[PDB]
Amino acid sequence: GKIEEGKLVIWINGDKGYNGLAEVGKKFEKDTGIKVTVEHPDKLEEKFPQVAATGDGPDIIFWAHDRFGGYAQSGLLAEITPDKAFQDKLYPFTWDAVRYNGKLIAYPIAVEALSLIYNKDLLPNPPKTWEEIPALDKELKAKGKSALMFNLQEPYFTWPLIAADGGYAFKYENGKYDIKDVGVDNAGAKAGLTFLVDLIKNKHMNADTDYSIAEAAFNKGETAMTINGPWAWSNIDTSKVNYGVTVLPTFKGQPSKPFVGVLSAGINAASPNKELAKEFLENYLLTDEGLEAVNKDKPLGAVALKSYEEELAKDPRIAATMENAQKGEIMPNIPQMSAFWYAVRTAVINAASGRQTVDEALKDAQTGSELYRQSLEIISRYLREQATGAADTAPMGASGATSRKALETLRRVGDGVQRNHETAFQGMLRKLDIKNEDDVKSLSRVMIHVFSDGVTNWGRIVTLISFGAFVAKHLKTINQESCIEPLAESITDVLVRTKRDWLVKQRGWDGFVEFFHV
Numbered sequence: 357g358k359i360e361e362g363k364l365v366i367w368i369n370g371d372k373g374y375n376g377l378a379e380v381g382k383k384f385e386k387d388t389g390i391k392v393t394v395e396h397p398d399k400l401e402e403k404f405p406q407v408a409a410t411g412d413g414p415d416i417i418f419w420a421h422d423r424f425g426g427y428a429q430s431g432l433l434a435e436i437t438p439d440k441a442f443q444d445k446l447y448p449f450t451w452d453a454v455r456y457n458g459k460l461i462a463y464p465i466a467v468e469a470l471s472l473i474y475n476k477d478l479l480p481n482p483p484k485t486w487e488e489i490p491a492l493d494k495e496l497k498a499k500g501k502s503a504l505m506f507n508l509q510e511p512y513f514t515w516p517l518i519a520a521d522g523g524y525a526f527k528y529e530n531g532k533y534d535i536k537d538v539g540v541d542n543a544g545a546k547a548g549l550t551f552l553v554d555l556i557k558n559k560h561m562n563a564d565t566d567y568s569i570a571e572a573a574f575n576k577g578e579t580a581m582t583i584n585g586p587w588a589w590s591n592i593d594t595s596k597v598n599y600g601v602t603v604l605p606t607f608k609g610q611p612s613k614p615f616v617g618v619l620s621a622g623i624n625a626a627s628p629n630k631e632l633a634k635e636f637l638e639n640y641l642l643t644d645e646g647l648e649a650v651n652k653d654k655p656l657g658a659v660a661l662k663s664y665e666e667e668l669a670k671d672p673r674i675a676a677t678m679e680n681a682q683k684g685e686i687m688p689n690i691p692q693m694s695a696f697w698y699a700v701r702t703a704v705i706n707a708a709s710g711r712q713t714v715d716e717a718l719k720d721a722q723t724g725s726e727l728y729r730q731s732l733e734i735i736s737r738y739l740r741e742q743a744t745g746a747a748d749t750a751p752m753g754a755s756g757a758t759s760r761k762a763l764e765t766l767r768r769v770g771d772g773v774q775r776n777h778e779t780a781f782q783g784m785l786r787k788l789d790i791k792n793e794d795d796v797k798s799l800s801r802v803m804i805h806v807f808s809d810g811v812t813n814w815g816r817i818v819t820l821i822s823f824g825a826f827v828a829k830h831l832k833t834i835n836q837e838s839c840i841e842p843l844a845e846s847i848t849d850v851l852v853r854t855k856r857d858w859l860v861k862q863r864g865w866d867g868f869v870e871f872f873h874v
């Protein structure tokens with residue numbers, strides 16, 4: 357749990373130009389004597405927050421911007437402070453993708469959007485609609501080909517179809533996200549995912565198709581179409597398939613709406629090499645020659661660097677990428693994106709395999725996606741009304757009946773725990789000696805140790821929240837009322853992170869209300 361001084365370790369995904377990046381690393385070493393190690397570990401976006409939390413991991417992490425808000429909220433990223441001269445060399449909308457709570461948390465590299473990639477030797481004209489793909493597959497099957505193969509294991513690739521007829525992650529209106537408004541189990545999302553499951557039912561696609569199987573089938577000329585990003589174009593070039601990159605097909609007359617990613621470079625908060633990392637990213641990578649080295653290995657898409665994007669913009673494959681991006685939406689970077697992606701990943705795999713119906717799969721994804729927000733509403737309200745003696749008059753909002761009935765249940769069963777276990781609560785309160793916001797930050801570790809490692813049931817969840825209320829009452833009494841919302845956020849994090857799968861299996865807080873129905 358200590359990063360080594362006087363070198364740079366970089367993590368980037370195995371689908372990106374990591375050999376090109378290593379070439380930029382060699383140029384840095386030639387000037388500075390500092391070795392640059394580029395690694396592409398499996399699941400690096402899940403590994404980074406685990407290793408970084410212990411003061412370990414790479415100096416620089418590359419991922420799409422959507423994961424970076426979670427990393428920033430967890431204190432895992434150094435604030436990026438480039439001068440005006442450097443900032444003005446990149447597109448302002450790319451800087452917006454890496455801004456979190458008013459602070460830049462990464463360097464933007466390139467804009468990524470999925471396109472429809474088609475074999476001009478099999479399909480001279482690509483289909484304008486999803487609805488015509490079954491008929492095309494039937495024509496191509498008669499010739500020993502298939503219409504379409506793409507990765508069905510990552511919701512990134514299926515999302516554009518789910519979003520087409522009105523599926524959404526977090527509602528965006530008046531230039532602001534309603535994190536309370538999730539659109540995963542609406543009629544639009546159901547129509548999109550039913551269309552995908554029907555393609556599998558009718559044997560136009562196979563539920564087991566992943567990135568490697570789709571790429572091999574397209575690059576060998578066995579399938580007429582794939583869905584992929586700019587990074588894929590290198591392997592297609594090598595294959596000598598006569599390919600086009602175009603607009604994704606429409607669904608029910610509406611565009612497919614890909615979630616747009618900005619490949620971004622974050623600096624580990626635990627790195628002792630932050631000045632070397634800034635130098636590397638600003639004066640080696642984010643140059644015409646640095647981006648060219650990476651782009652020549654695996655294409656980046658529409659680069660953040662204006663000078664180089666002017667050259668690449670002339671490429672009709674980049675025009676197609678930006679057309680799809682404009683029909684799509686820039687991903688949020690809110691910490692909840694991780695849970696959203698896990699919930700929709702499971703829904704698509706289960707619907708595609710027949711493990712769940714579309715209705716069952718998207719219900720669970722909806723419950724999973726709103727679990728943090730709903731849990732925080734209940735827990736924050738209970739802690740604050742316990743501390744002050746007065747309830748919150750603010751409307752409950754989305755799924756408000758559940759929130760109201762959960763808080764009602766918690767008042768009954770939680771007050772019971774605090775009354776019956778007053779001596780134990782007082783003993784643990786004094787032993788923990790909670791005085792201020794720094795001490796509250798130390799509770800997460802002991803909550804995971806005591807709560808998360810014990811049996812999972814609603815009773816032990818009531819104790820977790822009820823002791824939280826007991827601590828909140830103390831914090832109010834000693835003029836530390838400012839600590840209660842952070843405490844509520846910390847309890848919610850432990851509960852929903854460590855009991856995610858169990859909570860969704862219970863129908864979340866509806867399960868809680870039913871379990872303690874007297």
Ligand SMILES: COc1nn(C)cc1C(=O)N[S@@]1(=O)=NC(=O)c2ccc3c(c2)N(C[C@@H]2CCO[C@H]2[C@@H](OC)/C(F)=C/C[C@H](C)C1)C[C@@]1(CCCc2cc(Cl)ccc21)CO3
Nearest residue numbers: 780781784799802803806807815816818819820823824827
């Ligand atoms: C029929 O049975 C029941 N019906 N219902 C409604 C409940 C039970 C029931 O039996 N529940 S029980 O099994 N629950 C536990 O054991 C338990 C569960 C979660 C806990 C947790 C304990 N904690 C240790 C406790 C605190 C007081 O002394 C501890 C314990 O004695 C050593 C005790 F009193 C247990 C009695 C429980 C009622 C038994 C607190 C904890 C660690 C410390 C830091 C910290 C900070 C915050 Cl903000 C928030 C929480 C925490 C983690 O959360």
Ligand SMILES: OC[C@H]1O[C@H](O[C@H]2[C@H](O)[C@@H](O)[C@@H](O)O[C@@H]2CO)[C@H](O)[C@@H](O)[C@@H]1O
Nearest residue numbers: 369371420422423468510511512617697
């Ligand atoms: O499938 C969910 C997944 O989608 C995005 O990941 C993309 C990434 O943006 C691309 O650069 C490329 O590597 O493919 C990935 C999909 O396999 C999100 O960025 C990611 O957080 C999310 O889990």
